[PDB]
Symmetry: D3
Subunit: 221 residues, 6 copies
């Protein structure tokens, strides 16, 4: 495809989607066997390997709705991928969400215009695939992780002049801020494939755990 140089058939139907291509490399090296690197276009590393007997891929997405949209569109439309699990980080809005918590996004709010353009006059709520969500939730519960299932903000702007609306979203139970989920969920829905975002809380607005999170994402995917 335009941004992925990997053949037909080189990418597995199940794929993990870290924002950071170097985390894709870390995931492939740490968890996968029989690994090949299928992409280095724009340094956006993608790998395919085997995890407990199943082929799985792991592909960097870059940061932000537009970047992940490129890779997700190409993965689905050009490579026939069917299960896509973002594995990322996020920033907690509120005090009850703690660093190293694992957040599974049921849905995502956004300041992106991507869905207003597609559905003028409507608020589109991007939804996780429930089957994948349940699978990841159960795996995370079994793993002994602090797993929170809920709402996140998919932000276009990492640096905001005022965090007032972010705080307000926190008051309406939005757990954390990140920069990809709206796109992943919307595009997965568009193409009738299955998506989920599993996030580690790395900071506040106001690794051993990461490995466990990758494990539950691998298990789900």
């Amino acid at each position: 495809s335009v941004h992925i140089e990997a053949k037909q058939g080189e990418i597995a139907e199940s794929i993990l989607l870290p924002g950071d291509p170097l985390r894709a490399k870390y995931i492939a090296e740490t968890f996968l066997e029989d690994v090949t690197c299928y992409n280095n276009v724009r340094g956006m590393l993608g790998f395919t390997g085997t995890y407990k007997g199943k082929r799985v891929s792991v592909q960097g997405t870059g940061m932000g709705v537009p970047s992940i949209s490129i890779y997700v569109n190409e993965l689905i439309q050009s490579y026939g991928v069917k299960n896509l699990i973002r594995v990322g980080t996020c920033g907690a809005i509120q005090k009850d969400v703690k660093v190293r918590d694992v957040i599974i996004a049921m849905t995502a709010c956004t300041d992106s215009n991507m869905n207003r353009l597609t559905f003028p006059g409507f608020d589109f709520a991007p939804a996780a695939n429930f089957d994948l969500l349940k699978k990841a939730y159960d795996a995370g519960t079994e793993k002994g992780l602090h797993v929170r299932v809920g709402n996140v903000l998919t932000a276009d702007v990492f640096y905001r002049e005022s965090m007032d609306m972010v705080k307000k979203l926190g008051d309406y139970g939005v757990l954390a801020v990140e920069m990809e989920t709206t796109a992943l969920y919307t595009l997965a829905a568009k193409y009738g494939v299955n998506a989920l975002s599993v996030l580690t809380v790395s900071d506040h607005i106001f690794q051993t755990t990461f490995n466990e999170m990758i494990e539950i994402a691998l298990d789900a995917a």
Copy 2:
């Protein structure tokens, strides 16, 4: 409160929210014991009774975001309600959603402006309380119902000049159309209380209904 004539303490912390006040009456009569009617203001019947030893209420909401918003605000702010489960109907958008399926809304899209006003420049995605959602899903699964968990459209307009965008939403996996969930989920989130919508597919764009009420009561 303005639209509910109940005395303090007469409404249970767990409440079912049918759109139709006559369905509230049906639910109270069919499933509850030790029933009292606590509201007849605007004919919007509300009841409290006991289900398997727990006090539970059931309150009509009327149709549409503005109507349910009134009742949900009053229930939360004036009556200290904590768990709110809409029990409603919806119209399937897609072929794979069948009449009498039970839909549990994870989230809701909307053509309402309610959230654009509150969060200018943002798309707010109203989210179900996951704990309640899981509880209802597990109950419905155990019950042997066809339960679908997914996205719904909360519509302001029942009669649309064109259903092009509704069809498009169906193409993006939106399961069905109804007229309340956005408001219920948003206001519950605002006040830090727990909400869920459990819906019977009644049309396309009863025995089933009883089983759905049962799982809503159980989750509630």
Copy 3:
């Protein structure tokens, strides 16, 4: 129709539209003769009777644009209704509007998205039928009521976090807040039929009279 169980021909061409179905019952019982109840679907009572020799109906609408839109669409499209007069309550924004004043809405502002969806990029101003408006105004004047003709806000939200914009609308002469008029006026205009809203001021944001208001609405309709 979907929400009205009344036959063909059971609903009169002129109809009053209280938000409260129990007010429909009150109106039918108090003012009409030869009354039949043609609807109890969802408890949304509708009646037809005779007032000074003319058949007239009275139908609850419920609260809010979406609720009244349902009934108005069905009344016009399924029952051939031609003159629709909402008879409601409203909350005064400003000090110069007094409790028990009768407001006749020339037009309505709104926070609803209903018209932005229909006319993207435009502000649609829903307008009363002038003939009905004049008729009601003259009847109210003759009756000795305090009648104010002007602008109202049709609100989606009864409970607002901040009343700042409502106050601002009051500063621009918007008289009162209610929750139906935009829909009634827009749909009446769509179908080329005649609508009006006559409102009693019941509260501030910051019965003998009701009967007189029903009388002028009956006279107009």
Copy 4:
């Protein structure tokens, strides 16, 4: 004021507002006595004279919301004007509206952003002063004119790539298109003064004009 060179007190409390400054000249010459021209800034002629014993002014506004907004703001805030009646032309959308009909705008739709900026998230419906509207309607009726009271479109764009939405507005009873009323009505409402627009249908998408000026003067 910035765009009007009149001294304090030179402008009457009642004023007619044609879009065309040459029509202001025509109105002053044709109908008024004891006339003075109080403004020629930007050629936007303004006059004050006497009509049946009352001082009245007549001021060109130019075309479009931004142009009329300038003059109306200055007239209200700098000159203490209280009654403002636009006397203009418009283009009929619908077949049932005929050339030379007089339209009295009860309200106006618009494609302008002026009110979305002031009231974010709201549709503001600019409303005529009912007292003035009734006065003009009664005068026009008495005059034997075809007078239509209803909705108009205040357009930012005279030349539109597609008139689909204009046609749609006509389907919702919008009578005619013009380019000022939204601004006049909104600003009059802002400042608690009285405004009306009385329009002659000149096209579809004089003797009549004189009679319309007469009813505007009478209402004014």
Copy 5:
């Protein structure tokens, strides 16, 4: 055309566009020879004359996007005009822009809805014709003027309740406020013709020079 009474062929392919029709008269009288007045419809004076051997026209536009849009549409579509240079005034937002500075607008921000209607969901940035811009910039530089090339605000509202957003735009380098440029640039782009706005700073939000500015606009056009 509807608003211009001048024949076919009476208007030159190059035209200056002052907002004030009396400035059109001043420009024609002061700079042009062999002058004819081709329009007095609505007092919106338009002239054609000769400047250094070339026919050029000068046409008032009135104030505001809607007014200039009328004249620009008619000039392009009915009279085949190809080079359009607005010559106007503007109000400086910020302290570093001085009275009597000449501003050449590269682009314009706006509170107008004109472009949101044309390109729903998009921000359209109206752009000057670079060739004309360069020509005017070089002429202004040669003339010894203080010429600033940059961004302006095309306002619908001259009188704003709050100047907060205008100040904010000034903080983002927007130089001055005026009321025509968005329309001129957008319509010129629509029809594939060449436009520029050259503005004299006449005021702050918070003639010898004018003649020199007209001279550079004449030279460019």
Copy 6:
């Protein structure tokens, strides 16, 4: 900074901003001397070296408004960068724009919400720094390149369901589509620093690239 591991002073005041970090590497290797790599966080390579006696940096931005916004904010606010020149690719909308043409963006349209959030109710037109634009234009002209100065679309979506609006923008003279300029120009304006985007037409909806880098370095 959060996404750049450079020590204070390691990044030059003048910087080139390719979307592709591997192009940053190519630029540093091909054109610069005394090169150090100051960043590998997220593989988003950044280098500083010397070009004709001046320190200059080159930093990958990634694709899309949100990605470039992160880097540009950090470069300006944490590293005191003053002159920022995006060196990118774009897709021609129109027939008259040819592959390998160099486009210098005077401004950018966008489907991003970034500026609607900052300036509600306004269309913000992000503008290049004219001084830099002129410098690059003159360099490109001198170089014998086909240089077009004009409007571009900064897109959030590379893959669009319909390219109708993109075609329409091309009809209004928008030259090409790319995915960063709106952000770069807006943030540079916010912080009072100087930005420009110089783009190679790579597709429709190298030797050329080297010459373009050269003019960007010269302007920088």
